[PDB]
Design a protein around this ligand. Structure first.
Ligand SMILES: OC[C@H]1O[C@@H](O[C@H]2[C@H](O)[C@@H](O)[C@H](O)O[C@@H]2CO)[C@H](O)[C@@H](O)[C@H]1O
Length: 140
């Protein structure tokens, strides 16, 4: 099966207990730009609110934030970067009552407290130079 074409957009509806599962491979192929970006938008429109934004800078940091009323808010930085150049990853973003639980390759790495209710998310975009196998939302 061919990798998904990026930028990859997916209409979604998230509730507590939903899980976004993103499988792919990152490569060290960018200059001053992240190797993976994931944005959760409140409308099917790139100017809308971003409830959750994650980007990967291989060997440096995982960055998380929101974009509310056009403004990037408090940046949350991790220096634990489980993603590796050319190796497959399994990224899970689980919607809890108070936070997203961010999980990579079976490790719990961060709890991002909700800033916009996740019930307002309508579209996920996964982009940058990722070789993307699948993006799906499970309800349960
Ligand atoms: O916070 C997410 C936001 O980051 C912007 O870049 C930041 C960068 O993370 C920070 O280290 C630097 O000091 O300031 C920059 C803001 O100009 C990205 O431009 C944006 O797309 C998001 O990734």
């Amino acid at each position: 099966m061919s990798f998904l074409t990026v930028p990859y957009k997916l209409p979604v509806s998230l509730s507590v207990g939903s899980c976004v599962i993103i499988k792919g491979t990152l490569i060290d192929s960018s200059i001053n730009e992240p190797q993976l970006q994931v944005d959760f938008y409140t409308e099917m429109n790139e100017d809308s609110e971003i409830a959750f934004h994650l980007n990967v800078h291989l060997g440096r940091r995982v960055v998380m934030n929101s974009r509310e009323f056009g403004i990037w808010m408090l940046e949350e930085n991790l220096h634990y970067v489980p993603f590796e150049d050319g190796k497959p990853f399994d990224l899970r973003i689980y919607v809890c009552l108070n936070e997203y639980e961010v999980k990579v390759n079976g490790e719990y790495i961060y709890a991002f407290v909700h800033r916009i209710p996740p019930s307002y998310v309508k579209m996920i975009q996964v982009w940058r130079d990722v070789s993307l196998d699948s993006v799906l939302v499970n309800n349960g």
